Amino acid sequence: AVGACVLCNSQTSLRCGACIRRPFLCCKCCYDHVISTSHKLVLSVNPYVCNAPGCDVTDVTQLYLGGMSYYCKSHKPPISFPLCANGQVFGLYKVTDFNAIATCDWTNAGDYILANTCTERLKLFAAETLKATEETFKLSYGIATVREVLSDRELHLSWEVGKPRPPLNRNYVFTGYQIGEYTFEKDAVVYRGTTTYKLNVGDYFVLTSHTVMPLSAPTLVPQEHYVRITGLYPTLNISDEFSSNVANYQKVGMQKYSTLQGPPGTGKSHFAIGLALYYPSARIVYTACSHAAVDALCEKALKYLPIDKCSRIIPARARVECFDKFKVNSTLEQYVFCTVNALPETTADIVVFDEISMATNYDLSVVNARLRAKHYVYIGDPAQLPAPRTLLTKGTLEPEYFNSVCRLMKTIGPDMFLGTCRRCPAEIVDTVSALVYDNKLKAHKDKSAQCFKMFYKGVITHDVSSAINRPQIGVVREFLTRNPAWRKAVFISPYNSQNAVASKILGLPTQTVDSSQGSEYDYVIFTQTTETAHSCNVNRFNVAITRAKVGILCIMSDRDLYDKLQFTSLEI
Ligand SMILES: [Zn+2]
Ligand SMILES: [Zn+2]
Ligand SMILES: [Zn+2]
């Protein structure tokens, strides 16, 4: 019960019992919280509740100190002191933003704005509160039970009445019962068990509600700037491949932390791996939120770094298949590749946190708590997709509010910027450079003359809420017949249901914009499907068109984004 105030650090025994995270609040700050919010339960060794038998007064403003015990206005002794007076709550050792973080439901964008513009301790409080809210929200959904099993990849489900049904996409990883984690896709539904098991009729599923641990470390450690490269030993025989980043690698050694904004295909993973060749003695821990981001870093390290000093840390509860070419779970290796949730408690000369737009402040804090490093490097792009905020339904979350690192990149600018896109044909580079990069992204490739756009609204149907546009898939079918080189294209859309239809009608491999992030393909066929806030999101649009190395076909619903595409227009 001895603690330190979340708003002022002043020691106290007072905790708000009405806050989902029960934060320590000092006398002057506990008062400002209880008098301005619906939160009236104050905790200590003993709660501030009426000691009179059978009395239910728990409100601190309606309670008093009668000797050593607490009583309400109806039960207090003549010699008693109100717990709330002179702007203070009685306690040992004797805010507008804190109130809003403590009481909000996390369904509005303004809640996330606040959680990123507040003080550093309030950023951790917001992160802890939000994650706890997100996990209690998992209980609200209805249990799905296996009703029948057709084959090895298709089944039929029975849902719990009264309780709502969670949206069916690979974004919601279920838990089958402990018969392995399971994922679902849309009566013909597809069952995807992470662990191969004979799908039993009657076995129930439940969403993975994990316990939210407290945050101790800040999202960002305080910045230090040095006059010399500190604790890192460079080479003067740095391969000409990585010569373009020599000045930026030196900046990495002359600051506690550095931010790198890398638009698509500008060399983020080449920069990350080249940092190891530049400081060849440095123990580097490469971390990211997803297994895919960590695997993409493993793939680049396999080409440049010695395999015997690399280790891929895999959690014992192995969910999806990941990188198999490094020695598994050897924490002591010079190069450690591991997701944020699987990180061991260790130190490093450098920590590289990749795909920073996908990090939450909870992840930023966990990294600082599990890894003590001389230097931290944050690589990503605030013009790319952020982590899904399952509770956010109202308002659009801007890139400066994704996390602390993204807030810095959007406000003061990134420390390092990779300005040349080597992946995409110039049509794509020019479009996104003007859309999200203030005309600072340059094309390495020439125009491919294989970038097409078609303005075709089609017909929007819905699979619950996930959208389908069969006419847009029909336009793609007609195009494929005339453009056989496009037979090898990846179909991309902002919807799983659109992708499921396109996969059957076109036979092209399919990918949502969100799951395509970090991947590249020679040819991409994109159907916008609808003109909603989701499908018009400039960050999602940016990720969608920048997957293409050679050609892109964009079947558009929105006139604005269609007019911004610097592509050859097609008729029909
Ligand atoms: Zn305080
Ligand atoms: Zn509270
Ligand atoms: Zn009472």
Token pair in block for residue 1? 């019960």
CB 355 within 8 A of CB 290: yes
Q: How far is it, in rounded angstroms, from Cα 562 to Cα 545?
A: 12
CA angle 416, 420, 424 (to 5 degrees): 135
How many whole angstroms separate alpha carbon 284 and alpha carbon 376? 10
Residue identified by tokens 């010399």 is: 228
Span from the CA of 134 to the centroid of ligand 3 (angstroms): 36
Ligand 2 geometric centre to CA of 138 (Å): 22
Q: Cα separation of 525 and 551, whole Å?
A: 9
At a CB cut-off of 8 Å and minimum separation 6, what does 269 contact? Answer: 296, 297, 299, 300, 354
- Comparing CA positions, the residue from 50, 49, 45, 40 lying closest to residue 19 is 40
Burial class (CB in 10 A: 0-12, 13-18, 19+), 179: middle
Which residue's entry shows tokens 């792009």? Answer: 381
Q: Which helix (H) or strand (E) holds 286?
A: strand 284-288
Residue of 147, 202, 208 lying closest to 180 (CA atoms): 208
Ligand index nearest the alpha carbon of residue 3? 1
- Burial (Cβ within 10 Å: 0-12, 13-18, ≥19) of residue 308: exposed
Interatomic CA distance for residues 38 and 462, integer angstroms: 40
Q: Which residues of 213-227 are buried (b: 16+ CB within 10 A; e: fewer)?
A: eebebbbbeeeeeee
* 3-state SS assignment for residue 246: helix
- What residue spans of 452-537 are helical by DSSP H? 470-482, 496-506, 513-516
Which-ligand-closest: CA of 38?
2
Cα 10 to ligand 1 centre (Å): 6
Burial class (CB in 10 A: 0-12, 13-18, 19+), 58: middle
CB 496 within 8 A of CB 466: yes
State the ligand closest to the CA atom of 53: 3
Q: How was this structure determined?
A: X-ray
Q: Is 464 left (phi over 0), alpha (psi -120 to 50) or beta?
A: left
Is the separation of the CB atoms in 98 and 26 below 8 Å?
Answer: no
Q: In angstroms, how far apart are the furthest CA atoms of the chain?
A: 93
- How far, in Å, is the centroid of ligand 2 from the Cα of 47? 14
121 CA from centroid of ligand 2 (Å): 15
Can you read off the two tokens belonging to residue 511?
């990918």
Give the ligand at the shortest distance from the Cα of 66. 3
- DSSP strand pairing (371-380 vs 346-353): parallel
H helix or E strand, kind and range, residue 276: helix 268-278
**What's the CA-to-centroid distance between 501 and ligand 2, angstroms?**
48
Q: Which uninterrupted H or E stretch holds 130?
A: helix 120-136
**Residue 397: count of CB within 10 angstroms of its CB:** 19
Distance 25 CA to ligand 2 centre (A): 9
- Within 8 A by CB and 6+ apart from 112, the residues are 106, 389, 392, 397, 401
b/e per residue, 323-341, with b = 16+ CB within 10 A?
beebeebeeebbbbbbbbe
Give residue 91 CA to ligand 1 midpoint distance, Å: 12
Handedness of CA 236, 241, 247, 253 (dihedral sign): negative
Residues 6 or more apart in contact with residue 161 via CB below 8 angstroms: 142
- Centre of ligand 3 to C-alpha 58, Å, is 9
Report DSSP letters for 372-440, one per residue.
Answer: EEEEEEEEE-TTS-----TT--BS---GGGS-HHHHHHHHT--SEE--EE-SS-HHHHHHHHHHHSTT-
Least distant ligand from the CA of 75 = 3
CA dist 167 and 279 (Å) reads: 46
Please, what's the b/e burial string for 135-156 (b: 16 or more CB within 10 A of its CB; e: otherwise)?
eebeeebeebebeeeeeeeebe
Residue environment code for 96-119, b if the CB has 16+ CB neighbours within 10 A, otherwise e: ebbebbbbbebebbebbbbbbebe
Token pair 């409080």 is at which residue?
A: 125
Kindly tell me the burial class for residue 398, based on how many C-beta atoms sit within 10 Å of its own C-beta (0-12, 13-18, 19 or more). middle
DSSP class of 330: -
Among 376, 375, 566, CA closest to 452: 566
Ligand that lies nearest to the alpha carbon of residue 15, given by its number in the listed order:
2
Binding-site residue set for Zn(2+): 5, 8, 16, 19, 26, 29, 33, 39, 50, 55, 72, 75
Per the CB < 8 A criterion, the answer to whether 448 and 568 are in contact is: no
* Integer Cα distance of 467 and 455 in angstroms: 18
Length of the chain as a residue count: 572
The per-residue b/e assignment along 550-564, b for 16 or more CB within 10 angstroms, e otherwise, is bbbbbbbbbeebbeb
Q: How far is the CA of 95 from the centre of ligand 2 (A)?
A: 11
What span, in angstroms and rounded, lies between the C-alpha atoms of 428 and 451? 8
- Residues annotated in the binding site, as ranges? 5, 8, 16, 19, 26, 29, 33, 39, 50, 55, 72, 75, 262-269
DSSP character at residue 188: -
* Binding-site positions for a ribonucleoside 5'-triphosphate: 262-269
Distance CA 209, CA 201 (A): 24
Evaluate whether 546 touches 519 at the Cβ level (below 8 Å).
Answer: no
| Among 407, 393, 395, 391, CA closest to 129 | 391
State the ligand closest to the CA atom of 5: 1
* Rounded Cα gap, residues 42 and 49, in angstroms: 8
User: Which bin fits 485, alpha (ψ -120 to 50), beta or left (φ > 0)?
Assistant: alpha
Cβ-contact 270, 418 below 8 angstroms: no
Count CB-CB contacts under 10 A for residue 460: 17
Q: 33 C-alpha vs ligand 1 centroid, how far in Å?
A: 10
CB of 385 within 8 A of CB of 539?
Answer: yes
User: At residue 193, what are phi and psi to the nearest 5 degrees?
Assistant: -80, 125
Cβ(488)–Cβ(522) below 8 Å: yes
Write out the H or E segment, with its range, that includes residue 549. strand 548-556
Q: Calculate how far, in angstroms, residue 396's C-alpha sits from the geometric centre of ligand 2.
A: 27
Cβ < 5 A residues, ion ligand 2: 16, 18-19, 39, 102
Which residue in this structure is represented by tokens 């802890």?
128
Domain 426-564, classified CATH 3.40.50.300, yes or no: yes
Q: Which SS3 state, helix, strand or coil, does residue 455 take? A: strand
